[PDB]
Ligand binder design. Structure first.
Ligand SMILES: C[C@H](N[C@@H](c1cccc2nc(O)c(O)nc12)P(=O)(O)O)c1ccc(Br)cc1
Lengths: 284, 283
């Protein structure tokens, strides 16, 4: 075993924050609102196409540090080069299909482990190994406060027109979800015209009334609505899914990664992380 | 048969696994049930017993039927008779876990919780039902979840909460390990079982009941008057799920994982939840 893993992650608050280094190349010392030291790692990545050291922290970085300490491995973290989570796409109308995003980097060896809010699904599980879920959540819908839709069955979603724009993030698990089912083909035909490069851009477009509904992970959307009281979620969860650590099928770490996640759910470590990063007050 | 015909163990626990008598005139299981064998004891102070043909149905039985069809195996289903889900006694496992560990069953299908201890000796499928340690109260009572300081430090509040669980299982063991004061405080409010706890809540003798999320959601969905409610799912503690237990290194695990994930992605799991678990109380 090399024992030094290439970790790939992705910007995705509150799971992964990405901030510039200080002038001297280190990460500013910070504490959370509840007084815990914020553990920061150097993560190289694009920032606009050169790669530059940046500072990463959040729920997923805390989990990475717990895993590395428990199993005694070392690591280097980078941000996924294309900025995507990962879907499988046909190559140049060939026979071959190829994964983009973090999935593609893990399968190619550019990464040895994905530590990110990476959705567990059949499509990805065919090719990589997932841990047991480190977070249980689902899909919901973000709108500007004052926008009235019932949820995923609303006629403005099920009978789409250019008068009500809705979308998700390109090359993500939610993209897969709507492309998977022929029943959803009309919805997908609309979203494919409007899907955004990243969650943060889609969320800003909702605030700016350029995107009318954003379909995405509830653990992210409920957090965003908790900070930005002009945004709300609607419809509860219309689908339930979990996040897992991603590894190639030959990883020597996969059994102990899952055991550590299970131990951490059962002893309140995951509760601490959820309270620190994920949970928040309702607006009023 | 041979390697495609699998010994499978389960455990009666409605609505996940429901056990019925077989028709004595026909001795055939019909409707949505499948045959399941039970070793029924002769009396309470004996190891003697006799196998009885029963019929089994429920949420987990329909999962088993789908896996049987999709993964292409047949099975001989039996009900565990020594223990329940799985406990280690004197370094020996009983319950459903024991049947798998000691190679009497290829898989265990039931309301069997994925945890760290069991995962050292069996392999678990992906979770097929979400659960965890949750809280039920009468509508109007205000708490967040197990880690609420109204539970951790009840004497900071007036009057102090009365709250309990069903003792001697995984819930008490978890609270004992994680929250020593809470654990010793709640022993006075131990409930003999779920049904007793619901009555205690409804009649004002108990303020909160801490127990399995899936069980509590099911009971809340069916409550007369829809007055018993659970906490929000974001506040479930030690989130996990029910999963299928297989022997370490099982050749069936990959196929079973992919099949369960396909069922989830195609909505088939949602259909089963609506069929078996979702109740009239919608909030
Ligand atoms: C909430 C659950 N424990 C209860 C429970 C209720 C319903 C179904 C159950 N299935 C199991 O396999 C299991 O161990 N426990 C189940 P109980 O053992 O206290 O009655 C529980 C709490 C912490 C962890 Br660790 C595991 C289970």
């Amino acid at each position: 075993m090399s024992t030094r893993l290439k970790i790939v992650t992705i910007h995705q608050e509150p799971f992964v924050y990405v901030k510039p280094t200080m002038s001297d190349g280190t990460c500013k010392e910070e504490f959370t609102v509840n007084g815990d030291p914020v553990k920061k790692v150097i993560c190289t990545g694009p920032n606009d196409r050169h790669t530059v050291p940046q500072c990463c922290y959040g729920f997923c970085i805390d989990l990475l540090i717990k895993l590395a300490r428990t199993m005694n491995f070392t690591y280097e973290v980078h941000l996924v080069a294309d900025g995507k989570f990962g879907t499988q796409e046909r190559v140049n109308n060939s026979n071959k299909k190829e994964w983009n995003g973090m999935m593609g980097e893990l399968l190619s060896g550019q990464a040895d482990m994905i530590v990110a809010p990476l959705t567990i699904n059949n499509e990805r599980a065919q090719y990589i190994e997932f841990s047991k879920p480190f977070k249980y959540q689902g899909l919901t819908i973000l709108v500007k406060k004052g926008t009235r839709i019932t949820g995923i069955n609303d006629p403005r979603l099920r009978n789409p027109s250019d008068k009500f724009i809705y979308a998700t993030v390109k090359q993500s698990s939610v993209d897969i979800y709507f492309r998977r089912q022929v029943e959803l083909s009309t919805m997908y035909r609309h979203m494919e015209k409007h899907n955004y490069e990243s969650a943060a851009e889609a969320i800003q477009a909702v605030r700016d009334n350029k995107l009318h509904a954003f379909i995405w992970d509830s653990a992210v959307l409920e957090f965003e609505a908790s900070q930005k009281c002009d945004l709300v979620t609607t419809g509860e969860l219309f689908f339930r899914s979990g996040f897992g650590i991603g590894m190639r099928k030959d990883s020597p770490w996969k059994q102990n990664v899952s055991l550590s996640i299970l131990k951490s759910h059962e002893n309140g470590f995951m509760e601490d992380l959820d309270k620190t990063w994920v949970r928040y007050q309702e607006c009023d | 048969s041979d390697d495609n015909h699998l010994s499978i163990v389960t455990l009666e626990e409605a609505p996940f696994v429901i056990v019925e008598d077989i028709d004595p005139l026909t001795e055939t299981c019909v409707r949505n049930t499948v045959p399941c064998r039970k070793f029924v004891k002769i009396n309470n102070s004996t190891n003697e017993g006799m196998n009885v043909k029963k019929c089994c149905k429920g949420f987990c039985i329909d999962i088993l039927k789908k896996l049987s069809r999709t993964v292409k195996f047949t099975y001989d289903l039996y009900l565990v008779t020594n223990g329940k889900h799985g406990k280690k006694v004197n370094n020996v496992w009983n319950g459903m876990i024991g049947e798998v560990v000691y190679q009497r069953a290829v898989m265990a299908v039931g309301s069997l919780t994925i945890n760290e201890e069991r995962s050292e000796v069996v392999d678990f499928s992906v979770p097929f039902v979400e659960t965890g340690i949750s809280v039920m109260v009468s509508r109007g009572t205000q708490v967040t979840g197990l880690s609420d300081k109204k539970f951790q430090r009840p004497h900071d509040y007036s009057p102090p909460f009365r709250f309990g669980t069903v003792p001697n299982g995984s819930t008490e063991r978890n609270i004992r390990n994680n929250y020593p004061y809470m654990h010793q405080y709640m022993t006075r409010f131990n409930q003999r079982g779920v049904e007793d706890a619901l009555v205690s809540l409804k009649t004002g003798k108990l303020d909160a009941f801490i127990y399995d999320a899936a069980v509590l959601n099911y009971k809340a969905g069916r409550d007369e008057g829809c007055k018993l409610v659970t906490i929000g799912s974001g506040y479930i503690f030690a989130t996990t799920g029910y999963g299928i237990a297989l022997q370490k290194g099982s050749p069936w695990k990959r196929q079973i994982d992919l099949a369960l994930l396909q069922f989830v992605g195609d909505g088939e799991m949602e259909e089963l939840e609506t069929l078996w678990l979702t109740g009239i109380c919608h909030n």
